[PDB]
Amino acid sequence: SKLPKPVQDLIKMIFGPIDVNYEKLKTDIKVVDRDSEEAEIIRKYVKNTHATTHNAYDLEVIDIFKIEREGECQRYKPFKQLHNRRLLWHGSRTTNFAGILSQGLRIAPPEAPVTGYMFGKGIYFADMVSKSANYCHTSQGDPIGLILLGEVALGNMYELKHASHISKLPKGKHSVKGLGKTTPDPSANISLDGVDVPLGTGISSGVNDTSLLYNEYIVYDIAQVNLKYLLKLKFNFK
Numbered sequence: 531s532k533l534p535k536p537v538q539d540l541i542k543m544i545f546g547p548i549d550v551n552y553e554k555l556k557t558d559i560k561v562v563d564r565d566s567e568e569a570e571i572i573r574k575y576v577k578n579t580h581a582t583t584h585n586a587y588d589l590e591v592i593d594i595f596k597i598e599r600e601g602e603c604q605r606y607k608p609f610k611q612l613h614n615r616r617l618l619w620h621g622s623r624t625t626n627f628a629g630i631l632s633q634g635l636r637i638a639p640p641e642a643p644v645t646g647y648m649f650g651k652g653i654y655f656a657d658m659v660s661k662s663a664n665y666c667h668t669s670q671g672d673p674i675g676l677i678l679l680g681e682v683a684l685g686n687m688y689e690l691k692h693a694s695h696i697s698k699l700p701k702g703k704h705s706v707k708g709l710g711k712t713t714p715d716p717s718a719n720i721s722l723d724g725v726d727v728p729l730g731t732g733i734s735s736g737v738n739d740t741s742l743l744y745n746e747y748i749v750y751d752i753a754q755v756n757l758k759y760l761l762k763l764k765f766n767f768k
């Protein structure tokens with residue numbers, strides 16, 4: 531195999547022959563350099579946005595992969611000029627990552643239950659790494675998870691304070707944001723390319739009337755997501 535060993539390690543983890551399985555992902559996977567500015571930014575985002583409710587474990591970044599799915603840049607082109615683009619977390623089971631990288635993040639099928647959703651059938655993201663990391667479903671006997679960083683074109687956000695059955699957005703709105711009691715410090719936001727990265731440490735949002743601990747972000751069109759990084763995370767349980 532021509533591929534770097536961290537990429538090979540990643541392919542074995544995703545599938546349960548290396549170069550043929552890499553081809554099935556339809557994704558270009560580079561290893562982000564550990565000393566680069568990108569890696570420093572990504573590690574800061576992981577360190578700063580680990581919440582106090584989720585103190586069962588600490589997170590260690592093992593490998594950072596830059597990912598470019600085939601045709602996704604072209605699919606995302608209409609939304610790339612849209613304002614309020616953000617780099618946000620999406621966690622999932624390791625078993626879903628073959629489908630995720632080959633097909634992109636999808637909205638759960640019509641057959642999935644509408645009742646288990648805070649804000650309807652969309653694609654959910656967090657600005658707190660520990661919120662999304664819980665959706666890895668890692669365990670003491672299987673303590674390595676995968677987590678995405680997506681560029682999400684949020685546009686005008688419909689900002690809600692409680693769970694709502696959203697089937698359609700108000701005119702001019704492109705996404706929903708559930709407002710949490712705690713938020714990454716908005717004065718600590720940085721810009722990586724044209725994308726906002728909410729990597730400040732947690733503070734009180736000053737939104738008193740809300741039932742969510744942390745923010746979440748939902749989009750209802752799959753083309754509003756451009757996947758950027760895949761992190762292999764070690765969960766150190768307390």
Ligand SMILES: NC(=O)c1cccc([C@@H]2O[C@H](COP(=O)(O)OP(=O)(O)OC[C@H]3O[C@@H](n4cnc5c(N)ncnc54)[C@H](O)[C@@H]3O)[C@@H](O)[C@H]2O)c1
Nearest residue numbers: 620621622626629630633635636638647648654655662665
């Ligand atoms: N996941 C998060 O990081 C996250 C962030 C903020 C907030 C939330 C919170 O989760 C709640 C929703 O969870 P639930 O799994 O019930 O719903 P839902 O998100 O629709 O489940 C579908 C699963 O299918 C995965 N997948 C997507 N594309 C593909 C694909 N091509 N191939 C295969 N699998 C794919 C996806 O990752 C997910 O695990 C929601 O109500 C909200 O409270 C999560």
